Amino acid sequence: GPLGSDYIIKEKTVLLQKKDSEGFGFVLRGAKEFTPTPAFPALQYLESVDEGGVAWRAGLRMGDFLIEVNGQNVVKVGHRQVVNMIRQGGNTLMVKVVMVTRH
Ligand SMILES: *C(=O)CCCC(=O)N/N=C/c1ccc(C(=O)O)cc1
């Protein structure tokens, strides 16, 4: 608006169940105490998502920011620690993300 940026923020929580011989189908990237902002809500985001893969079919998309992994908040958690948390769940991953559109 005239006084500042307007955004739509969509939260998505999904259950990923994969097979032993595949990945969840996404590439995680760390952007950098940290204070979340609308434009920058979390440290880790989906740099890419394999179209038709497990993560895609559940509704995850490139650019989604990761908020929680398996009931633990990861908004302020570094890249290697989040990767490890995801691998701890094996073939199951419950994740909450936020998608942000800026105008
Ligand atoms: C995971 O694969 C998603 C992106 C991760 C990534 O881009 N890692 N790159 C790391 C890296 C570390 C050091 C250098 C360097 O100093 O030359 C470059 C890239």
Numbering used by the authors: 651 to 682, 689 to 759
Task: Copy the relevant paper text.
As a model β-strand mediated PPI, we use the GKAP/SHANK-PDZ50 which, plays a role in the organization of synaptic protein complexes and has been linked to several neuronal disorders. There are >250 PDZ domains with several therapeutically relevant proteins known to exhibit their function through a PDZ mediated interaction. Class I PDZ domains bind to consensus sequences with a Thr/Ser in the -2 position from the C-terminus, with the C-terminus hydrophobic residue and free carboxylate being the main determinants of affinity. Here, we used dynamic ligation screening to identify peptide-fragment hybrids linked through an acylhydrazone bond, that are able to functionally mimic a β-strand and inhibit its PPI using GKAP/SHANK1 PDZ as a model interaction.
